[PDB]
């Protein structure tokens, strides 16, 4: 079961927050909850639908963080000519994933953007 202000779906508890935060601050806010939580993860379409039913009333059209960060690191970048990728000069930016409180489709956002969020833990 779920504490007051949280909602239950298949053994987990979920709560949306409106306070805009960057990804790292949002994830930390969930981690500071009395039951240590995380930004929402989606394991199914039915789970995503439930979550947007939660966000729709108060988060509305706001962007909402989900628990995937730095999505362009780990892509196994290589040179088309087969040269060694030893020298590096990437811009220092990272992107994280978000959804709209209205829709389940994912969106890439700069990790320093401030968005609403939803926290999740297992009951």
């Amino acid at each position: 079961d779920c504490p007051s202000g949280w909602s239950s779906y298949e053994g987990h508890c979920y709560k949306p927050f409106n306070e805009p935060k960057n990804w790292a601050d949002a994830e930390r806010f969930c981690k500071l909850q009395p039951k240590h939580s995380h930004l929402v993860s989606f394991q199914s379409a039915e789970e995503a639908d439930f979550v947007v039913k939660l966000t729709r009333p108060r988060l509305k059209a706001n962007l909402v963080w989900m628990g995937l960060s730095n999505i362009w690191h780990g892509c196994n970048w290589q040179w088309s000519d087969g040269a060694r990728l030893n020298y590096k000069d990437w811009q220092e930016q990272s992107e994280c994933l978000a959804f709209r409180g209205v829709h389940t489709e994912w969106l890439n956002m700069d990790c320093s953007s401030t968005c609403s969020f939803v926290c999740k833990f297992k009951a």
Binding site: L39, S41, Q43, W72, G74, Q78, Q91
Partner: protein, 134 residues
């Protein structure tokens, strides 16, 4: 050896910046059709980064271009490269249907055509070919 007409020498390679706007894949294909088989430029040192930035800056026709393709390409097959959620679970379900691939590298006008950025592969932009003549 010897760079052909239109190509610029730096170290042991020849280079050319093209203002023809092409997707990353078309640009790489076009480079492979030049001379003895060029490719989108690899950048392997600070001096080569300086050189490529200068070369793009020398191209009058590239005055209003925001991005210029170079040969950086992600090899991971996934459409986003985080395979674990912050909660530790593996990514299976994904809802990327509205989004487009960002797994190609470019130089960008905003930062002087020096720092690498990733951008959308299917967008048409200017590009630079690098050749080892032979």
């Amino acid at each position: 050896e010897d760079c052909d007409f239109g190509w610029s020498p730096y170290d042991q390679h020849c280079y050319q910046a093209f203002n023809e706007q092409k997707t990353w894949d078309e640009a790489e294909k076009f480079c492979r059709a030049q001379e003895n088989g060029a490719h989108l430029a690899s950048i392997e040192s600070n001096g080569e980064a300086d050189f490529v930035s200068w070369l793009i800056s020398q191209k009058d026709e590239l005055a209003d271009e925001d991005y210029v393709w170079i040969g950086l390409r992600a090899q991971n097959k996934e459409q986003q490269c985080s395979s674990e959620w912050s909660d530790g679970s593996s990514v299976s379900y994904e809802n990327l249907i509205d989004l487009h691939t960002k797994k190609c590298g470019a130089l960008e006008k905003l930062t002087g055509f020096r720092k690498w950025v990733n951008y959308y592969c299917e967008q048409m932009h200017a590009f630079v070919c690098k050749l080892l003549p032979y």
